[PDB]
Amino acid sequence: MKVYKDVFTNDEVCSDSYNQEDPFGIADFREIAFEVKSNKRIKGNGMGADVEQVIDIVDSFQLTSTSLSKKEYSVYIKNYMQKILKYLEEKKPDRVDVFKTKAQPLIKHILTNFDDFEFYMGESLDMDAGLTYSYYKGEEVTPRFVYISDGLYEEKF
3-class DSSP assignment, residue 146? strand
CB atoms within 10 A of CB 93: 9
Phi, psi dihedrals of residue 44, rounded to the nearest 5° = -100, -15
Q: How far is CA 129 from the centre of its chain?
A: 10
What's the CA gap between 30 and 44, in Å, rounded?
Answer: 30
- Are the CB atoms for 61 and 11 separated by under 8 Å? yes
Residue 98 to residue 121: CA distance in whole angstroms: 25
Secondary structure of 38-66 in HEC code, one letter for each residue? CCEEECCCCCCCCCCEEEHHHHHHCCEEE
CB atoms within 10 A of CB 153: 16
Task: Return the beta strands (E) in the chain as ranges.
Answer: 2-6, 12-15, 33-37, 40-42, 53-55, 64-66, 118-121, 132-135, 144-148, 152-156
Structural domains of the chain, with CATH: 1-157 (2.170.150.10)
Using CA atoms, how far residue 63 sits from 56, 57, 89, 125, in Å, is 10, 8, 28, 8
CA 82 from centroid of its chain's CA atoms: 17
CB 145 within 8 A of CB 132: yes
142 residue type, one letter: T
Alpha-carbon distance 69 to 124, whole Å?
21
Cα–Cα nearest to 99, from 25, 149, 133, 26? 149
Contact 76, 68 (CB under 8 A): yes
